[PDB]
Structure formats: structure tokens, C-alpha cells
């Protein structure tokens, strides 16, 4: 309050430069401030949520504004296969002359928007720049609304009471109904009123959306339940997305499968889809009691699930108490569920490409998947990091008297021993088989390889109709129960998309699928060995049982008792962030090298040269970095010269991380003394004396900043290589 | 398309905003 950390007086008394860094990194740590109690905490995170949401909508209004103003959006609408989607323009004063010829696309010098945004705005039904301006203003207004609320609920009499925050009971009555159920219903109110007619040629802007019904007859003879009229005449075959030719007029037809032409999902399928998800979520909103009293008390829902089998402790009696009073448990479930949702998003954006003329630009599809996978891994590691924060700064094993959680801390030894077992097994049985296949391929003999057919994935693709394997089971067999059971409904529009080898749906599978998917499960089980380790040994280990007393990110225990480098629950974060970047590494190298074989066409280039490691370092890193690393030559440059620069730049980020990760503090803490000796002793600079005393970075910060350069270097290197690689082999 | 606006906003937010914002935040350490 006096100086800097206007929030912690334990850091304002510090004369060093640690008051700055810990003043920054403990700013959002609202549970550890001067005198901020519970009401003063929820009444601050609730306002900062609004500030956050307004930052999100300021950002999306940013994309709407630059696409509205510097992009080539409607020219892209004219030819979505040919013209590249432009991002915002450039103003460098550093582009001398030869750079500008490598960026001119029309009058603009803009970047090429490799983020899939024109596809989604083209399936929404935005066919102009004018709607992008009205939308951008429509989100500047919304960000002003959210900043108004966060400023407004920190105004004192509008700061809501904590009993309102502990209406945990009824947020689920309103999120599942209002946020999820209504809005998705409202999103059908977009798709029925905008995306279906502006895909079927009818420009239904903001004028005739009440005078032109999306079905030619609607809602006066349609409370009678004659709902097959809304799925009467589908858009069958002979249609191009955007015009009115070859298209019917039904709204909610569930054909299943793709377009024949744009290789995306039907918008009738999405209108019916979000409509059904909307109805089911609105039904799920009627789940819990309120002031009315028709629902479920959550205490009666966790208290009742104590098994009389008796194996599962004294049941969940104690769990509802440690979700209301806790937050890091609730944030751990939030990041867990959001993270599995992101990985589901990533595993479906390529597999079932939703957006017209995606899977035709092979860079934006390659960036959306990798984007949501690295964000997926970040949010899992957040779920376990706040898991360990829950077990340290939030866990009460007296309200959790022999609870399910206390049972978890009881058998955490068996948990960590068996995670370490499966991780060891997969690490001797991916690396064993890749070094086997790589030695054997190296010794003039690709035949003596171990290739195991991944028959379980091939059988599961046979359960979804991929007839290219010869199992002839539930959907691959055309005479079975499920094959007849949806023979009219959605099968023949969908098995065409399955049995095709053009689309990225249910890919053809060699033993690279086997060896890589074991490598992925190695990554998941190592990363949960670490995270579940320093989330269950977050509280106390047999090295030091004092760990719960020191908080989350305490540095160490000194050299005592053998040495104690990185014992904290923050280490599990600190190490499983490397395993996060690694595991999402192998996921996206595998995906990206699978689709550089599909999109090129030579699937045999993958399946012959991916079962061993020089297949990866040869056929994928050495070959596909060739149009990258030719980004600028001593003969000139091209448009990839940004990424080939960034690539190199990112290596310089990555290895600077090692300077903090490898080489720890007491080197630098006795080197800053040489620098401060030399600054104090010299003339003409001893006048300019510091105020904060120069001190080397503390060993939680140092491992953290080395981790941050490891992430930024890693992710910028691979975002350089995805985009420069696919943008070099194509576009 | 007001093409002149990045020639104003990209310098006045790119360089002079992390000059005066260094002044506001760094004097704001001592306020």
C-alpha cells in the first residue's frame, strides 16, 4: 500500500529488485494479500472476470475491425479457393524496399490471415465488410458493457454479497439454461435466419429476417407438430456454397456428412445440432432448487452417493463443503473440463471441418488444430496446478474426515507407483520400438522392422463404417443392426465421408498410428505422473512433511537431508510444462506430418517413413523446413521471410531459457556484486545510483522465467514451422 | 480506407506509448 505491491507489506519493505518481480507475479494471487478476506476476494475476482471478458471482446472486435478495414474479405468471398485470406496490414518503417515487394497483395501489403477466421465468418453469413463494421462496433459496445459491469460491481453497494456467490446451487440452473441452452438456441436463431438463407443465396441481412421466414410456411400451422416439413427438401448435391443453385429449402435436415463441394458440414446439420443441444441444455437447467424449491439440493446429491459396499471411504460426504469454500478445486475442475473440451475441439476441427472451404487452405486448418492442442495442454496443466494449490492452501482433512479426497491422499503411493509403471512401460516400448526400427532400417533393411498393426483403432473405424480394413462389423457391415437402424436417417450421407480418403475423417492407419499413439499415451502418463505426483505429494512427502506449511511455490529446503532442489508443488507444474510442450509436441508433429502426407497425397511417404525416427528427422523436419529456411537468401527473400526470421528468433528465445533453467542463482548473485562494485566504484556513474538494490532473480522466478522462454521459444518455433511449412509447400 | 492511420497509431502506440507508459508505471512504483 505504501510502495508498489500496494497489496502486500511483506514485499514493500524489500529494498531489492525482488519487490518488482514478486510485486508482479503475486498481483493476481488474491488469496494472499494484506487483509483481503472472502467477500473482498469474490468481489474482486468477480469484477476482474468482467475486465477479462471485455478484453476478449475487445480482441474479437479487433479481428472484426482489421478484417473489416485492412483485409480482403469480400474479395475472398468472390474466390475462396484462389485468393489468400489477408490479415491486418503492415506499417514497418523497417521494410526498406525489397521487403515490400514480398508482401503486396493488391494495394495492401498485409499479412495472410492463417487463423481460419474468414471461413467461420463466411459460414456465419457475413458476405460484406459492412456487417463486419457493425459487428466490430457491436463488440466495442459489448466490451464497454463488461467494463461497465466490472467497474459497476466494484462500486460499493453493488458489490454482491457472498451468499450470492455461494448460490453455487443455482448458477448451474442459469448457466446450463441461459448461457449454454438459450444462447445455442439463439445461435440456431442465427443459423436458421442467416446462415441457411445466405448459404442458399438469399441475402437475409437485418431487413427481411422477420418478413422472409426461412421456411416458406412456418409457425402458424407448425405448433401442430408436423415437424418433418422442416426437413423436407435438403440441399442434395449440385450446390455451391453461397449461391441459390441446386439447393432446397428445408431448415433442419440431418443428412450427416459433408458438402460434396466445400468439404464442410451442412449448416442444416448445425442448425438442427445446436437446436437439439439447446433443448437438452435447457432441460438440464431445471436441475437444482432455488427460492422456488423444485430441484436438487447438492448436499443431498453428494451425501447420497456413499456406497454400502463400503470400499469408497465414508462416501462423498465432505465434497460439497470443499467446493463452496474452495476455489482452486472449482478452478481445477474448470480448467480440466475446458481443457478436455479444447482437445475435443481440436480433434474435431480437422476431423469434421465445420467451415466451408476449410480443408482447402491447408495452413489455417494446420494452425487451428495446433493452437487448440497447445491451449489444451496448458489448461490441463492449469487444472493440476490448481489441484496442488487446492491440496496445499485449500484442503481441510477434518471436514474431509476419511473422505474420498482423504482416501486419495491415502493411496497416492499406489497412484504414483502405477503412473510411473505405465509411463516406464510405454517409454521402453515406444523408444524400444523406434530404436529397433531405426537400427534395423539403418542396417539396409526396412523389412526386419517391428510393425504392429493398431488393430483396435482399425476395428473402431470398422465400427464407424470405414470399409477399407475388412472387419465387417456394426457400421462397416451394411446388414447389421445399426446399419439398418439409421439407413435412411444419417448413414449414407456419412459413410461417403468415412470411406473417402480425401477428407481428414477416420484416416487410413498404418503402424505409425500404433507407435505414435503409444508415444502420446507415454506423454499423458508421464505428465500425469508429474502433476499427480506434485499434486498428491503437494502436501507432504517423506522427504519433508512440512510442505503444506510453505505454500505452493516455495523454493526448496536447502542442501539439508541430501539436497532438496525443486521439492515444491510448483515443481510438478515446472516439469510437466516441459512434458506438456513435449507431449503436445508429438501430437502436433504427428498430426502435421500425417496431413503433410495426405495433402501432398503420398500417404505411403508417411507409412513407409514414419515407423522410425530418421523418418521424422528426415522426411518431416529436414524436408519440410526447406521452404521455411529459404525464407530469405543472399539472392533475395519472399513472403515467408517473416516466419523464417521468427523461427530463428524463437530458437534464441528457447536457448535463453536454458540459461535460467540450467544455471541457477548463486552464480549470478555473486556476479551482480561485481557489477554493483564496478558501478559504485567508477566515476561519472556513481551519481546515478539505483533505488531498488540490484539482486539476481530468485530461484522460483528463475525457473519460471526459464520456463517462459522455453514455452515462447518452443511455441514460436513450431508456429513458425507449421505455417511456413504448409505455406511453403502450398499457397 | 484511411490508409494514413497506421502511420500515426503504429508509432504513437509502438514507441511513444512504451516511453510515457514506462514513465507512468515507473513513477507509479513510487506513488
Amino acid at each position: 500500500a505504501t510502495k508498489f505491491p500496494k497489496f502486500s507489506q511483506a514485499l514493500a519493505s524489500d529494498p531489492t529488485t525482488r519487490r518488482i518481480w514478486y510485486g508482479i507475479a503475486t498481483a493476481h494471487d488474491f488469496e494472499s494479500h494484506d487483509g483481503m478476506t472472502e467477500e473482498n476476494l469474490y468481489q474482486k475476482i468477480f469484477a476482474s472476470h468482467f475486465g477479462h471478458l471485455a478484453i476478449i471482446f475487445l480482441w474479437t472486435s479487433g479481428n472484426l475491425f482489421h478484417v473489416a478495414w485492412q483485409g480482403n474479405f469480400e474479395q475472398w468471398v468472390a474466390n475462396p479457393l484462389k485468393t489468400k485470406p489477408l490479415a491486418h496490414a503492415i506499417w514497418d518503417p523497417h521494410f526498406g524496399q525489397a521487403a515490400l515487394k514480398a508482401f503486396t497483395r493488391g494495394d495492401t501489403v498485409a499479412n495472410i490471415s492463417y487463423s481460419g477466421v474468414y471461413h467461420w465468418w463466411y459460414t456465419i453469413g457475413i458476405r460484406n465488410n459492412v456487417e463486419l463494421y457493425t459487428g466490430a462496433l457491436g463488440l466495442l459496445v459489448l466490451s464497454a458493457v463488461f467494463l461497465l459491469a466490472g467497474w459497476l460491481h466494484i462500486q460499493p453497494k453493488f458489490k454482491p454479497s457472498l451468499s450470492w456467490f455461494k448460490n453455487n446451487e443455482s448458477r448451474l440452473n442459469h448457466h446450463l439454461a441461459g448461457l449454454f441452452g438459450v444462447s445455442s438456441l439463439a445461435w440456431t436463431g442465427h443459423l436458421v435466419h442467416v446462415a441457411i438463407p445466405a448459404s442458399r443465396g438469399q441475402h437475409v441481412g437485418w431487413d427481411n429476417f422477420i418478413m422472409t421466414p426461412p421456411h416458406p410456411a412456418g409457425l402458424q400451422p407448425f405448433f401442430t407438430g408436423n415437424w418433418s416439413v422442416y426437413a423436407q427438401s435438403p440441399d442434395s448435391m449440385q450446390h455451391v456454397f453461397g449461391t441459390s443453385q441446386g439447393a432446397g429449402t428445408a431448415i433442419l435436415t440431418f443428412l450427416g456428412g459433408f458438402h460434396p463441394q466445400t468439404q464442410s458440414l451442412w449448416l442444416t446439420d448445425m442448425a438442427h445440432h445446436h437446436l437439439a443441444i439447446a433443448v437438452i441444455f435447457i432441460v438440464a437447467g431445471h436441475m437444482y432448487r432455488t427460492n422456488f424449491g423444485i430441484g436438487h439440493n447438492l448436499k443431498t446429491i453428494l451425501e447420497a452417493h456413499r456406497p454400502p459396499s463400503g470400499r469408497l471411504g465414508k462416501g462423498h460426504i465432505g465434497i460439497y463443503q470443499t467446493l463452496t469454500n474452495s476455489l482452486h478445486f472449482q478452478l481445477g475442475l474448470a480448467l480440466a473440463s475446458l481443457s478436455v473440451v479444447t482437445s475435443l475441439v481440436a480433434q474435431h476441427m480437422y476431423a469434421m471441418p465445420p467451415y466451408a472451404y476449410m480443408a482447402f487452405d491447408y495452413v489455417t486448418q494446420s494452425a487451428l488444430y495446433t493452437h487448440h492442442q497447445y491451449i489444451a495442454g496448458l489448461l490441463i496443466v492449469g487444472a493440476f496446478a490448481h489441484g496442488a494449490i487446492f491440496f496445499i492452501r485449500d484442503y481441510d482433512p477434518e471436514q474431509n474426515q476419511d473422505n474420498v479426497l482423504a482416501r486419495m491422499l491415502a493411496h497416492k503411493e499406489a497412484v504414483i507407483s502405477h503412473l510411473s509403471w505405465v509411463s516406464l512401460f510405454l517409454g521402453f516400448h515406444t523408444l524400444g520400438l523406434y530404436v529397433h526400427n531405426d537400427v534395423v532400417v539403418a542396417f539396409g533393411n526396412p523389412e526386419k522392422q517391428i510393425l504392429i498393426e493398431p488393430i483396435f483403432a482399425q476395428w473402431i473405424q470398422a465400427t464407424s463404417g470405414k470399409m477399407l480394413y475388412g472387419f465387417q462389423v456394426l457400421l462397416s457391415s451394411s446388414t447389421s443392426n445399426a446399419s439398418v437402424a439409421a439407413q435412411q436417417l444419417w448413414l449414407p450421407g456419412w459413410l461417403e465421408a468415412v470411406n473417402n480418403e480425401s477428407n481428414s475423417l477416420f484416416l487410413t492407419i498404418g503402424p505409425g498410428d500404433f507407435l505414435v499413439h503409444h508415444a502420446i499415451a507415454l506423454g499423458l502418463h508421464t505428465t500425469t505422473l508429474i502433476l499427480v505426483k506434485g499434486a498428491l505429494d503437494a502436501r507432504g512427502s517423506k522427504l519433508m512433511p512440512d510442505k503444506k506449511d510453505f505454500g505452493y511455490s516455495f523454493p526448496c529446503d536447502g542442501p539439508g537431508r541430501g539436497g532438496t532442489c525443486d521439492i515444491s508443488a510448483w515443481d510438478a507444474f515446472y516439469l510437466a510444462m516441459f512434458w506438456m510442450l513435449n507431449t503436445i509436441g508429438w501430437v502436433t508433429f504427428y498430426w502435421h506430418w500425417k496431413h503433410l502426407s495426405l495433402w501432398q497425397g503420398n500417404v505411403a511417404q508417411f507409412n513407409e517413413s514414419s515407423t522410425y525416427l530418421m523418418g521424422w528427422l528426415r522426411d518431416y523436419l529436414w524436408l519440410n523446413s526447406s521452404p521455411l529456411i529459404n525464407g530469405y537468401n543472399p539472392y533475395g527473400m519472399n513472403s515467408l521471410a517473416v516466419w523464417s526470421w521468427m523461427f530463428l528468433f524463437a530458437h534464441l528465445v528457447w536457448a535463453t531459457g536454458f540459461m535460467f533453467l540450467i544455471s541457477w542463482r548463486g552464480y549470478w548473485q555473486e556476479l551482480i556484486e561485481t557489477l554493483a562494485w564496478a558501478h559504485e566504484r567508477t566515476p561519472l556513474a556513481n551519481l546515478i545510483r539505483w533505488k531498488d538494490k540490484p539482486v539476481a532473480l530468485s530461484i522460483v522466478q528463475a525457473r519460471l522465467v526459464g520456463l517462459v522462454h522455453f514455452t515462447v521459444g518452443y511455441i514460436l518455433t513450431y508456429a513458425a514451422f507449421v505455417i511456413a511449412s504448409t505455406a511453403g509447400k502450398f499457397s | 480506407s484511411a490508409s494514413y492511420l497506421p502511420s500515426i497509431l503504429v508509432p504513437t502506440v509502438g514507441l511513444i506509448l512504451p516511453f510515457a507508459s514506462m514513465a507512468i508505471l515507473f513513477i507509479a512504483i513510487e506513488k
Binding site: 474482486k44 469484477a47 476482474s48 468482467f50 475486465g51 471485455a54 475487445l58 472486435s61 475491425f65 473489416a68 478495414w69 465488410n129 459492412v130 463494421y133 466490430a136 462496433l137 466495442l140 459496445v141 466490451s143 464497454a144 467494463l147 461497465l148 466490472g150 467497474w151 466494484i154 462500486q155 | 480506407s1 484511411a2 492511420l5
Partner: peptide, 27 residues
Amino acid sequence: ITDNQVFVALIMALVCGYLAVKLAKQL
């Protein structure tokens, strides 16, 4: 595609900037 809507845009996010500093100097 025009210029006046860009001015209207930076007006609305300038006001939104005043709500940003307005929220910022209370928490």
C-alpha cells in the same frame, strides 16, 4: 471500406479506454 466508420470505431474504443482506466483505478 470507408473512413468515417474508422473514426467512429476509435471513438467507441476511446470511450472503452476510458472505462478501462476507470475500472483500472478502483481495484
